[PDB]
């Protein structure tokens, strides 16, 4: 439920790591950094963190998947103009 990381799969030369973030995390541009005992900080890469309408514990959670699609994933909108009767 907080920042965490765990190796789901591994071989001799690689680790498959599942990283979680808190449901109340600060959004924006992030840097992921690795610290190996007795070494200097190493930059692993950059990622951007956003709000999650798909997560039940997030403040922007939406009950419906159709509503999630319509109000977050659809780029084709309709602005209604004119008069009330037209």
């Amino acid at each position: 439920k907080w920042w965490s990381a765990v190796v789901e799969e591994r071989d001799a030369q690689s680790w498959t790591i599942s990283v979680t973030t808190p449901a109340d995390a600060v959004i924006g541009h992030y840097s992921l950094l690795l610290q190996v005992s007795g070494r200097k900080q190493l930059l692993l890469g950059q990622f951007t963190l956003l709000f999650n309408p798909w997560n039940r514990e997030d403040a922007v959670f939406l009950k419906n998947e159709a509503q999630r699609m319509e109000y977050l994933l659809n780029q084709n909108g309709l602005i209604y103009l004119g008069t009330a009767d037209c």
Partner: protein
């Protein structure tokens, strides 16, 4: 006074706990005190993953409690478009009525779900079906101030002057 563990897993969309439970107890249609299966809970909260797990483990897609509320009824009432689709592909009956003779189209139109109403109509739902008081879906759409639902039902050739048992038109 607590729910069965499978109902709790269905509510939380916890497929790992549900898988462990179904490995231990192979019955996905376990009944709560109200008589609702975990598929009813999954349809209520639109938990797609646990619903697919339950249906793959043999849950009755057309389960009928004493009150006659099928999971399709709950999905149509709640506005769960994806759950309505999934239940329809798995064999959900389109004409089943509740204790008060409400079809899933009645539940969709009463709450003004245009997409769900169109999906049910495209699957053959009866647009002129009546409740115990003679209310058609257009009556329920007009009662809830659901303008687009009334428009869609009229587009599907619903009777604009259908009367209830009290001779009430949608007007």
């Amino acid at each position: 006074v607590r729910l069965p563990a499978l109902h709790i897993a269905a509510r939380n969309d916890d497929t790992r706990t549900a898988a462990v439970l179904l490995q231990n107890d192979p019955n996905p249609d376990v009944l709560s005190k109200t008589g609702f299966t975990p598929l009813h809970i999954a349809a209520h909260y639109e938990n797609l993953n646990v619903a697919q797990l339950l249906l793959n483990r043999g849950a009755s897609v057309n389960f009928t409690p004493q009150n006659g509320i099928t999971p399709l009824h709950i999905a149509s009432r709640r506005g769960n478009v994806i759950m309505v689709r999934l239940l329809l592909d798995r064999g959900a009956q389109i004409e089943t009525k509740t204790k008060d003779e409400l079809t899933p189209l009645h539940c969709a139109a009463r709450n003004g779900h245009v997409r769900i109403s169109e999906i049910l109509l495209d699957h053959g739902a009866p647009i002129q079906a009546k409740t115990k008081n003679g209310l058609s879906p257009i009556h329920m759409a007009a009662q809830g101030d659901h303008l687009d639902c009334v428009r869609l039902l009229l587009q599907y050739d619903a009777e604009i002057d259908d009367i209830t048992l009290d001779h009430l038109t949608p007007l």
